[PDB]
Amino acid sequence: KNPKSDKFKVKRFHHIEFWCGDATNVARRFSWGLGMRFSAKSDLSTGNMVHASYLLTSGDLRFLFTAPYSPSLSAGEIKPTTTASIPSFDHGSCRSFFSSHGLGVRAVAIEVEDAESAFSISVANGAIPSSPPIVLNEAVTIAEVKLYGDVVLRYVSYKAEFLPGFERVEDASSFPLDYGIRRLDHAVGNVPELGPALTYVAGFTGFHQFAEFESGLNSAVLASNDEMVLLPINEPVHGTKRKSQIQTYLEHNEGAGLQHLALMSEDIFRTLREMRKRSSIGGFDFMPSPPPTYYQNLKKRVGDVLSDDQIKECEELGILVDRDDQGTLLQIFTKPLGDRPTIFIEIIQRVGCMMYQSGGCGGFGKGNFSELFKSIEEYEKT
Amino acid sequence: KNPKSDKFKVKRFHHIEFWCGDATNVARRFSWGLGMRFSAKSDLSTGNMVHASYLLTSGDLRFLFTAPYSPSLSAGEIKPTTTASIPSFDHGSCRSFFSSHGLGVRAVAIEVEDAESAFSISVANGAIPSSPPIVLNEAVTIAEVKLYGDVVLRYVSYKAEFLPGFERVEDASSFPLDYGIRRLDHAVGNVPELGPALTYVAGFTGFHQFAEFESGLNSAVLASNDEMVLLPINEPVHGTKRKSQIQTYLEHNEGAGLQHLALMSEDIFRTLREMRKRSSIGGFDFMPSPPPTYYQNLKKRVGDVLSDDQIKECEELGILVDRDDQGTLLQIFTKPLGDRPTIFIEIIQRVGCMMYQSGGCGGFGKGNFSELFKSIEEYEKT
Numbered sequence: 161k162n163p164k165s166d167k168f169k170v171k172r173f174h175h176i177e178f179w180c181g182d183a184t185n186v187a188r189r190f191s192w193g194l195g196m197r198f199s200a201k202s203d204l205s206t207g208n209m210v211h212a213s214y215l216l217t218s219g220d221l222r223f224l225f226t227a228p229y230s231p232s233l234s235a236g237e238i239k240p241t242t243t244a245s246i247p248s249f250d251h252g253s254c255r256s257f258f259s260s261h262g263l264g265v266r267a268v269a270i271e272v273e274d275a276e277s278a279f280s281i282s283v284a285n286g287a288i289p290s291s292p293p294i295v296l297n298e299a300v301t302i303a304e305v306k307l308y309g310d311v312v313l314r315y316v317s318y319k320a321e322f323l324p325g326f327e328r329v330e331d332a333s334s335f336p337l338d339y340g341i342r343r344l345d346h347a348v349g350n351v352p353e354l355g356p357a358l359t360y361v362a363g364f365t366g367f368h369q370f371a372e373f374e375s376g377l378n379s380a381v382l383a384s385n386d387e388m389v390l391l392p393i394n395e396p397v398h399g400t401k402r403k404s405q406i407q408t409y410l411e412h413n414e415g416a417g418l419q420h421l422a423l424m425s426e427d428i429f430r431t432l433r434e435m436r437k438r439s440s441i442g443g444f445d446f447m448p449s450p451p452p453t454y455y456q457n458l459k460k461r462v463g464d465v466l467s468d469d470q471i472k473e474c475e476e477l478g479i480l481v482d483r484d485d486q487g488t489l490l491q492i493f494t495k496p497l498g499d500r501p502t503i504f505i506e507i508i509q510r511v512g513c514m515m516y517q518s519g520g521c522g523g524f525g526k527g528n529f530s531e532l533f534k535s536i537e538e539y540e541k542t
Numbered sequence: 543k544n545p546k547s548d549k550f551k552v553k554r555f556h557h558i559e560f561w562c563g564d565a566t567n568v569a570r571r572f573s574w575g576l577g578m579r580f581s582a583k584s585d586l587s588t589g590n591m592v593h594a595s596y597l598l599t600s601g602d603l604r605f606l607f608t609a610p611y612s613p614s615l616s617a618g619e620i621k622p623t624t625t626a627s628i629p630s631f632d633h634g635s636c637r638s639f640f641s642s643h644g645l646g647v648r649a650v651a652i653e654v655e656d657a658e659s660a661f662s663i664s665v666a667n668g669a670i671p672s673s674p675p676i677v678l679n680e681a682v683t684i685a686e687v688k689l690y691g692d693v694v695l696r697y698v699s700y701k702a703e704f705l706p707g708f709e710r711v712e713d714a715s716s717f718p719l720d721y722g723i724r725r726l727d728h729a730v731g732n733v734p735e736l737g738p739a740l741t742y743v744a745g746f747t748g749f750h751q752f753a754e755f756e757s758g759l760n761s762a763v764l765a766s767n768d769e770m771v772l773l774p775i776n777e778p779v780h781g782t783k784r785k786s787q788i789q790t791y792l793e794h795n796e797g798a799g800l801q802h803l804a805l806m807s808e809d810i811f812r813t814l815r816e817m818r819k820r821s822s823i824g825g826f827d828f829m830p831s832p833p834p835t836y837y838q839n840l841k842k843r844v845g846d847v848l849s850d851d852q853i854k855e856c857e858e859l860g861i862l863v864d865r866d867d868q869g870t871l872l873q874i875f876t877k878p879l880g881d882r883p884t885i886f887i888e889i890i891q892r893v894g895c896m897m898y899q900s901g902g903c904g905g906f907g908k909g910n911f912s913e914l915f916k917s918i919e920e921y922e923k924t
């Protein structure tokens with residue numbers, strides 16, 4: 161059931177913004193680890209005395225990395241005279257965010273038809289304002305409302321290239337890395353209580369519950385009208401044999417925040433070969449692979465969608481496979497991206513649901529939890 | 543003249559500690575960029591609830607990267623019951639350092655015979671104490687005194703493997719990168735006034751002025767008895783045509799601090815080929831190369847030490863060459879390591895002064911300033 165109740169016109173995910181201590185080192189690490197190209201910058205060299213911001217791109221995926229300079233560089237400025245290219249930025253907010261949470265996502269940005277209308281309608285329907293709409297060079301409008309914890313939902317609308325005040329990076333410094341990642345599929349939050357969090361966000365967006373088809377979490381997914389903007393939210397399940405990773409997140413993050421970003425690949429085998437080659441030379445590590453009993457039991461449930469050769473290839477790369485009623489999901493998870501056991505990345509590819517491909521085709525892998533438990537027990541039973 | 547006046551027995555540089563916001567991303571970037579291997583760790587996985595610390599090594603060079611966790615993880619601990627492996631660490635100090643200075647060196651650590659005696663003698667001779675001597679697992683003693691700004695000189699002494707509480711990293715996660723870097727040659731501070739800074743440091747160490755043989759700086763070098771621990775200090779020269787990079791540093795760093803680390807390579811051509819290959823894929827960028835008039839004029843002054851083929855090879859890699867009265871210096875500088883125009887790295891190799899090689903063989907390249915000015919003018923005169 162898709163009631164199509166968006167209170168304003170939503171298009172697609174636009175970018176994800178990380179708040180960092182040093183944007184340069186995080187951006188370079190992420191670029192090499194994920195195969196994303198340096199695309200634009202806003203920093204001292206472009207006249208920004210407030211923050212250093214670097215944009216990486218792969219396909220339509222946009223990762224922005226931002227860190228504050230010394231406030232002394234901009235002490236004479238006021239908001240009307242700021243050299244910040246992101247006018248919602250605040251030194252104190254950014255340092256407080258990073259001290260509290262460590263490296264993590266500050267903004268989940270979606271493109272809308274009219275960011276001022278989106279902000280107004282959102283706030284009229286219960287959204288906590290974070291930064292009011294501001295028109296940049298008469299060309300782009302940006303506004304922010306609270307999503308959960310200290311994460312904001314950022315509305316961006318274009319009249320008619322990332323943001324005014326950003327510069328294309330020179331091709332010499334812009335190496336065309338590409339491991340196959342193409343777009344953000346979903347962005348997942350961890351909260352202490354799912355109920356109030358769902359009611360709040362669905363209250364001000366009009367996003368609807370996206371239907372799914374006992375290991376530490378209850379979850380629900382909010383979706384835009386065409387189900388291309390997907391925002392799952394998890395809460396912990398307490399009193400379990402194994403401690404909930406949702407609870408671990410909330411402890412180490414100092415509360416609610418963004419848990420994982422799922423990045424769609426146009427070829428998950430190529431992406432995983434390329435990322436795994438780089439795991440121990442500056443890139444990203446992956447969670448421990450499932451036991452081979454998991455891949456022994458895969459032919460019995462997706463053997464009509466994947467050949468034995470491609471099931472073998474999943475076993476090499478440690479890829480997980482789940483089946484919906486409409487499509488199939490290939491997925492794998494990185495270890496945490498930074499010092500804390502908080503944010504991580506998921507790589508995914510979906511097969512099925514062609515009309516273009518409809519959103520959330522194959523679900524989110526909820527079945528892979530019990531399937532991993534069963535497979536682990538069978539391997540250890542042997 | 544070497545009066546050999548060390549007030550306590552100094553051995554060699556032991557490690558450099560960076561204070562970070564996220565130690566994981568900086569360490570992985572540096573590892574790939576410089577060819578340093580992951581060697582040891584102290585973090586949640588080793589029971590450290592206070593700070594995440596990762597050690598990279600190349601030859602005898604040791605880079606340590608440390609960032610604070612949420613203080614909530616260790617709120618019940620007191621100093622007698624701490625799980626920190628570096629007992630001088632303090633959450634507030636580390637966050638204040640990073641907010642003030644951004645990514646940078648907190649500690650220049652030298653190995654001594656007796657860290658408690660070194661601390662006592664240093665303080666008796668004017669050193670400002672930073673952290674008192676503490677004996678770790680009855681095996682290693684560490685103490686800290688202020689060096690300049692918020693940089694500390696760290697004394698380490700061993701009775702008889704980095705530090706107690708650190709663990710060797712698994713070989714799977716420890717890839718044997720190596721671009722030829724072998725040891726720290728010198729560590730350079732920027733101060734507002736050279737005079738008081740020299741008097742302070744030479745006052746409490748007994749280090750002596752190391753002799754040298756008009757572009758923004760006055761400098762002087764302090765050296766240990768065998769001149770293997772070398773600590774240059776710069777001050778700005780004001781009222782110049784071009785603004786002093788020393789002054790720029792002091793502005794963006796919010797005061798005095800460590801300006802550059804010079805890393806000795808056993809083969810600077812191999813190191814530079816390897817680092818330059820990686821500049822745009824997560825590694826380090828280098829300063830703009832000199833005009834070819836510089837390499838045209840090199841045969842006329844080091845043509846007896848380098849062949850025309852190796853002078854050509856310097857031109858490819860952008861290497862600078864300076865001549866002393868005792869040796870020759872090959873050197874090159876990276877762009878700043880992080881967001882701010884503050885700390886950078888120098889790669890060097892020295893040729894001459896064999897007895898082993900004596901320290902500072904060839905100087906520090908002071909002559910390359912005028913030689914670059916002359917060469918630039920000649921190229922542009924054409």
Ligand SMILES: Cc1cc(C(=O)C2=C(O)CCCC2=O)cc2c(=O)n(Cc3ccccc3)c(=O)n(C)c12
Nearest residue numbers: 348379392393394405493506524525526528529532
């Ligand atoms: C199969 C599966 C699915 C998902 C997932 O994406 C997802 C949800 O289930 C809820 C709905 C929204 C959504 O998108 C996430 C994970 C996952 O995070 N971890 C990491 C983990 C980290 C630490 C301890 C234990 C496991 C997995 O191991 N699996 C097997 C996962």
Ligand SMILES: Cc1cc(C(=O)C2=C(O)CCCC2=O)cc2c(=O)n(Cc3ccccc3)c(=O)n(C)c12
Nearest residue numbers: 730761774775776787875888906907908910911914
């Ligand atoms: C020839 C040379 C030598 C040294 C150096 O190491 C050194 C000193 O001179 C003083 C004594 C201690 C010491 O060790 C440093 C640099 C250097 O930092 N930069 C970067 C720069 C960055 C921004 C603007 C302008 C230049 C150079 O361009 N050159 C040519 C250098």
Ligand SMILES: [Co+2]
Nearest residue numbers: 348422506524
């Ligand atoms: Co997911």
Ligand SMILES: [Co+2]
Nearest residue numbers: 730804888906
């Ligand atoms: Co130097």
